[PDB]
Each structure stands twice: as C-alpha cells, then as structure tokens.
Amino acid sequence: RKESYSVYIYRVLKQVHPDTGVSSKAMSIMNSFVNDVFERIAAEASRLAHYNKRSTISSREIQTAVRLILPGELAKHAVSEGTKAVTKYTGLQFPVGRLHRILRKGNYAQRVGAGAPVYLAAVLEYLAAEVLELAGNAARDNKKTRIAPRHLQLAVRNDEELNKLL
Numbered sequence: 001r002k003e004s005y006s007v008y009i010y011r012v013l014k015q016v017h018p019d020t021g022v023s024s025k026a027m028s029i030m031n032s033f034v035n036d037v038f039e040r041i042a043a044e045a046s047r048l049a050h051y052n053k054r055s056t057i058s059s060r061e062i063q064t065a066v067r068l069i070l071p072g073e074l075a076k077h078a079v080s081e082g083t084k085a086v087t088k089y090t091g092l093q094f095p096v097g098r099l100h101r102i103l104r105k106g107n108y109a110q111r112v113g114a115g116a117p118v119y120l121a122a123v124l125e126y127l128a129a130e131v132l133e134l135a136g137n138a139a140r141d142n143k144k145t146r147i148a149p150r151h152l153q154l155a156v157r158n159d160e161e162l163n164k165l166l
Contacts, residue, residue: 021146
C-alpha cells in the first residue's frame, strides 16, 4: 500500500556517506518514514488548495504544507531547498516525474502543477539526507560500515525536531 523510494534513499546516502551501506531493515524504515512524510504533506497541500478555492496544487501549497508540518529549523532548510529547486528547474535524487504521478492520484479533481513535485522532491531528499547523516554518524562512531535501525532510532532520538516529526 506504500511506494518504494529505496533507490533514491540509497542514492542520497552515497552523497552523504559514500563508504557507508545500509541494512534492509533500516531501508524499509526509511522508506516508510518517507511515505509517512509524503502523504502528510500531500494531504495538507490538497486541503490548502480546497481551502483557498483553488484546484491546482502548486509549489506554493507544498511549501506552506511543509512549513505547517516540519518543526523549527527543519522547515527553514526544507523551504530553502524547495524554493531553490523550483526556480532552477522552472541534481535532485528523487523522481520528480514519479512524485508528480503520485500527487495526481491523491484526488483527480485537484490538478497538480509541475513545480509541486520539484519542491517535494527536494524536501524529501533533504529529510532523507538529514536522517542518514546522523544515523551514519552513529555508525562510524562505532566503526561499523553500514547503518542499522539502531542507528536510525538513535538519530531520531537525540534530534528533538526529528523526534517531534515522528
């Protein structure tokens, strides 16, 4: 019932920790985490568009959705990433073409603009890179060569903003 971002979650880590791997138990936890984040933002952006008497979800509704979900300085960076990405593409490790397709199925009565998945791909790529950086740090501190769910929940634990995001 969930999408598969394991390819792009892995492509992000080789940019964050090139000589580090990830367990498959830790891979599905990241994949489900990215899924819980996508749907929450897509649900808010849809309500925001229906709230403001609109019907095409744009990068504007994606940002305000992100600002209304990610706490503190997580929303500060994710907004910087989404805005920077949208202007550059009217690179990114997430499939903008696939994320656009997923956004449309949320409700076919609401159109989806081209700039919305560009913003969402950057935010998802940022939230992935931040978790794998802290989880990758906890693994190299233990001299281990790949990330386990132990280092995942450890990364979320000592990060209050990440822990508030669940």
